[PDB]
């Protein structure tokens, strides 16, 4: 099973930087963030 | 100025791992993920 996760108080500048990084990898913001969080969780 | 981010279909296994990491650092999941998003955005 799975759930939608909401991150509050993301500053405008930060959100635009993340959207640019997602687009550079030719991904949705959600897909990009999911993949990075999965990489973070996989390392000690 | 601030914005909501939505991450869809975070698998339970991964969400449990993130919640544990946030709690270990005495942070809300949202504040922990805001810190990680800022690290992602910062790197070359």
Automatic annotation (TrEMBL), chains A, B:
Q: Transmembrane segments in this chain: where?
A: none
Full-length numbering of the shown residues: 1 to 44 of 75
Q: Signal peptide span per the entry?
A: none
Task: Output this protein's name.
Answer: Antitoxin
Supply the source organism for this entry: Mycobacterium tuberculosis
Q: What's the domain of life for this entry?
A: Bacteria
| One BP term from GO | regulation of DNA-templated transcription
Where in this chain does the record put each Antitoxin FitA-like ribbon-helix-helix domain? 3-39
